[PDB]
């Protein structure tokens, strides 16, 4: 391979950059020739690159004016390995004017991908190309909108020579240009390639070979290339690189180092391959680039070492990062997305800075932050920097959150609503009690709007009900009792036991205002709760600060209260289906409101009495069809009243039973021992209490009918008849005493010999009064009797034919 390795490149706007391919033999990437307008056919007839042999990724051609044929551009292109495919395509030729023929007569095999050729109004010589002899998947090609299917441009096959095969149903010669044929190797040479006489080459030769059966003469390597020899696998100490060649450790390490100090694909070694990155569960070492399994999860180090954060997109690359090998200066000029992208950071190699971030109430999103080296210090030798943070209130829950800074001073200035107590906790938690100097932390600007005096308000009485809860706490009084405008009561459901005020500016924190007590503990009663739900409640005081913003307010620690339970809700969707003649399967859904821990379910079933009107209605007549079953304003008002009071005081004074089942740990039930085709009413309840006076819901009703017996409407019993002197017959039959629900009537079909089958209906009342049927005036001959019991299930079985000679 005389030539360089030539990492992939693109050429635009002129042919001046085209000369960069002069000393090239192989492209270890993708070659793009696109966007060429100021060119003429005179600019391409004297330009060729015979040294080019094979391309690894793909070849894109798009809008190159003046190009007429590629037969001179790439006379020796042979292989498109297609390691990376441009939109699952390995060869795209799009929108070429002046282009008339492909001309790539040496193109033999494409490892993977497909070929797309489109919008080439002047392109010919496409019918003489056998893509099945080159590509390995010809069903994904998209070759449309060319000149072949719109016109009949000449397609000269140099027959006299070019091999002719079948594409769909006809033999057509295969050729590339008017002077070149599409060579077809013998079927034995599937991929080795064939020489002039058509003889198979070495097992590793691909496409073409100078000498058959010789790995040292392959033009292209089928598996791997090494020192002018094609080998099936890389022997040690060579690792497979780019899926087409073999290389030692020195070059791969050099590439890694070159990537270390540049803008890249930091290369690592894994399973004897220099893959771009270690796969999941692995991590490189300093001594060797081995992708040793650090662990399923890995130290996810992300490289940058300064970067500002202003939006979600700027924080997108930080998602999943654990170690930042740099510094963070977050300036969000705007919550959940912040906790999504960030919050997995454990360690920062440099310094962290927060600046003028408007929409950050707290830094709780930095959940996993534990340590910062601070090797790189912000100007002023500061590791943690805070400035002009408007709405920032709390940094972290220092009761549980651990944060340690290896070195660096603290900067806290111009934070209107950051209580100085948190700044004091900074040094006791991070161990920076004496690491700072004077003026490092502003004493007069931080916490100018924070009543974090929190005179501990202690609750004194809590009463809980299924829907209402009453609170009572010890009353508070500032030194001037007129300043207490009133209390504010906060409450919000807390299924977890770790809830503090942490929300944006936004929060649910259902708040109700309470007037000050009339001078009895203040207290308050709550409404509209959810039974069996944990609640978090705390109380804060609203007071009017003095001239120097001395609030001296009072706060209550967050307490958790859990309201008691009640009777649960109705079970949902009770379905009762007859899966057998005596079996009923019952299924339901859990209640919407459990209102406590459900203990069991209460089920009742009662036999349904059939309609009595059916026992008295006649269906022998017509109608035989059978249905089958703000604040500042109020503060100024209060201060105005207090001021008038004070002025008056200054002026005036002068100092001289049903079958039931208890379903436990289940949602379905089966009922047995029920008569066939019997209706049933099912009562279903849910209970969260069993021994002490069960708390159960209201009854749930669903009607079910068992399957009828298949042998219950069949008439059993010998039919006995009586003959009168005037040929009158009395017919009686024994009904199936246990029928499918009930039998509406009986159908009788009698046929005398020589006549047709008649019909007759016996109603229930008729059957009762006549004990069957009474036919009078019978013609002489021999008759037959067949009676079928028609129940709600349908027609049954006929009786034995009662032959009698009259």
């Amino acid at each position: 391979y005389p030539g360089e390795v030539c990492p992939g490149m693109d050429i635009r706007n002129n042919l001046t950059r085209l000369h960069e391919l002069e000393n090239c033999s192989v492209i270890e990437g993708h070659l793009q020739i696109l966007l060429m307008f100021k060119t003429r056919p005179e600019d391409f007839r004297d330009l060729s690159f015979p040294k080019l042999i094979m391309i690894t990724d793909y070849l894109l051609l798009f809008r190159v004016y003046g190009l007429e044929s590629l037969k001179d551009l790439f006379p020796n292109l042979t292989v498109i390995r297609g390691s990376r495919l441009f939109f699952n395509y390995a060869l795209v030729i799009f929108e070429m004017v002046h282009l008339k023929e492909l001309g790539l007569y040496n193109l033999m095999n494409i490892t993977r991908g497909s070929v797309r050729i489109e919008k080439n109004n002047e392109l010919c010589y496409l019918a003489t190309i056998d893509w099945s002899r080159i590509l390995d998947s010809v069903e994904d090609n998209y070759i449309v909108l060319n000149k072949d299917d719109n016109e009949e441009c000449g397609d000269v096959c140099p027959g006299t020579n070019c091999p002719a095969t079948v594409i769909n149903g006809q033999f057509v010669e295969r050729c590339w240009t008017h002077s070149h044929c599409q060579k077809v190797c013998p079927t034995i040479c599937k991929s080795h390639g064939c020489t002039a006489e058509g003889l198979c080459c070495h097992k590793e030769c691909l496409g073409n070979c100078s000498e058959p059966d010789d790995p040292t003469k392959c033009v292209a390597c089928r598996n791997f290339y090494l020192d002018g020899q094609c080998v099936e696998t890389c022997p040690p100490p060579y690792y497979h690189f780019q899926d087409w060649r073999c290389v030692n450790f020195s070059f791969c390490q050099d590439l890694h180092f070159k990537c270390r100090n540049s803008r890249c694909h930091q290369y690592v070694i894994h399973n004897n391959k220099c893959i771009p990155e270690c796969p999941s569960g692995y991590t490189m070492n300093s001594s060797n680039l081995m992708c040793t399994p650090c662990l399923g999860p890995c130290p996810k180090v992300c490289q940058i070492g300064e970067k500002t954060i202003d939006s979600v997109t700027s924080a997108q690359e930080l998602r999943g990062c654990t170690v930042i090998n740099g510094s963070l200066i977050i300036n969000i000029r705007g919550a959940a997305e912040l906790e999504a992208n960030l919050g997995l950071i454990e360690e920062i190699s440099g310094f962290l800075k927060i600046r003028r971030s408007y929409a950050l109430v707290s830094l709780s999103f930095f959940r996993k932050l534990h340590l910062i080296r601070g090797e790189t210090l912000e100007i002023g030798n500061y590791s943690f920097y805070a400035l002009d943070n408007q709405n920032l209130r709390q940094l972290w829950d220092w009761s549980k959150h651990n944060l340690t800074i290896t070195q660096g001073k603290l900067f806290f200035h111009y934070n209107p609503k950051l209580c100085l107590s948190e700044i004091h906790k900074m040094e006791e938690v991070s161990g920076t009690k004496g690491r700072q100097e004077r003026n490092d932390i502003a004493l007069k600007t931080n916490g100018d709007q924070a009543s974090c005096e929190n005179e501990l308000l202690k609750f004194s009485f809590i009463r809980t009900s299924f829907d209402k809860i009453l609170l009572r706490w010890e009353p508070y009084w500032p030194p001037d009792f007129r300043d207490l405008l009133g209390f504010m009561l906060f409450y919000k459901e807390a299924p977890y036991q770790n809830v503090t005020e942490f929300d944006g500016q936004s929060n649910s924190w259902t708040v109700v205002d309470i007037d000050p007590p009339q001078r009895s503990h203040p207290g308050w009663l709550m409404r509209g709760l959810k039974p069996w739900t944990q609640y978090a409640i705390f109380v804060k005081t609203l007071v009017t600060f003095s001239d120097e913003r001395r609030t001296y307010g009072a706060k209550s620690d967050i307490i958790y209260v859990q309201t008691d339970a009640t009777n649960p809700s109705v079970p949902l969707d009770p379905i009762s289906v007859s899966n057998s003649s005596s079996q009923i399967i019952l299924k339901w859904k859990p209640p919407s409101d459990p209102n406590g821990n459900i203990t069991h379910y209460l089920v009742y079933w009662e036999r349904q009495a059939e309609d009595s009107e059916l026992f008295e209605l006649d269906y022998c007549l017509k109608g035989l069809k059978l249905p089958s079953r703000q604040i500042l304003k109020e503060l100024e008002e209060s201060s105005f009243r207090k001021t008038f009071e004070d002025y008056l005081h200054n002026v005036v004074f002068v100092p001289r039973h049903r079958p039931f089942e208890k379903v436990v740990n289940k949602e379905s039930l089966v009922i047995s021992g029920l008569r066939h085709f019997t209706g049933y009413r099912i009562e279903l309840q849910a209970c969260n209490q069993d021994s002490p006076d069960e708390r159960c819901s209201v009854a749930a009703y669903v009607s079910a009918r068992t399957m009828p017996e298949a042998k219950a409407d069949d008439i059993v019993g010998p039919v006995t008849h009586e003959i009168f002197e005037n040929n009158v017959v009395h017919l009686m039959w024994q009904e199936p005493k246990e029928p499918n629900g009930l039998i509406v009537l009986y159908e009788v079909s009698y046929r005398r010999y020589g006549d047709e089958e008649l019909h007759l209906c016996v109603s229930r009342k008729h059957f009762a009064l006549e004990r069957g049927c009474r036919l009078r005036g019978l013609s002489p001959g021999n008759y037959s009797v067949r009676v079928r019991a028609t129940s709600l299930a349908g027609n049954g079985s006929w009786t034995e034919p009662t032959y009698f000679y009259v």
Partner: peptide
């Protein structure tokens, strides 16, 4: 005055009869 003595500072029973006949 008087309020600046009693609500700001603390007034003893001695300080109150100064307002008395």
């Amino acid at each position: 005055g008087i309020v600046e003595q009693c609500c700001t500072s603390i007034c003893s029973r001695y300080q109150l009869e100064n307002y008395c006949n």
